[PDB]
Structures are given as structure tokens and as C-alpha cells.
Structure 1
Amino acid sequence: DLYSRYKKLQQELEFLEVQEEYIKDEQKNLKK
């Protein structure tokens, strides 16, 4: 319960950070 929620929250943070980096790279590519 608590540990599962905490672990999924870390996973979803890491996933969202990956999406942020990917979107920033796509923004630079689209500007080019």
C-alpha cells in the first residue's frame, strides 16, 4: 500500500522527467 504507492510515485517521476527531456529535445529540433 504505502510502499507500493511510494515506489510507483518514484517511477512516475522518473518517467515524467524522461518525457520532459524528450520534449525539450524535440522543441530544439522543431526550432531548427
Structure 2
Amino acid sequence: DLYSRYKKLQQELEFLEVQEEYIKDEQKNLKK
């Protein structure tokens, strides 16, 4: 195991919020 499971999905969660934040600046630049 249980200890490793949120030792993968936490890092995946932080990464996913990070590039999920990047998408809005991508699509903002596309309009410019």
C-alpha cells in the first residue's frame, strides 16, 4: 504494498497539476 501506491500517484498528481496548469498558457499563446 500500500505504501508505494500513493508513492506513485502523488508524484503523478503533482506532475498532472503542473502541466495541466501549462495548457492554459499554451492555448493562450495559440490565440496570440
Q: Taking structure 1 as the reference length, what is the TM-score of the superposition?
A: 0.75
- Quote the Cα distance in structure 2 between the aligned partners of 1:3 and 1:27: 37
Match of 1:5 in 2: 5
Match of 1:25 in 2: 25
Q: Which has the higher helix share?
A: 1
The answer for unaligned runs of 5 or more in structure 2 is none
Paired positions, count: 32
String of CA shifts for 1:1-32, please: whole Å, max 9, x gaps. Answer: 21110111100001111111111110111111
The answer for unaligned runs of 5 or more in structure 1 is none
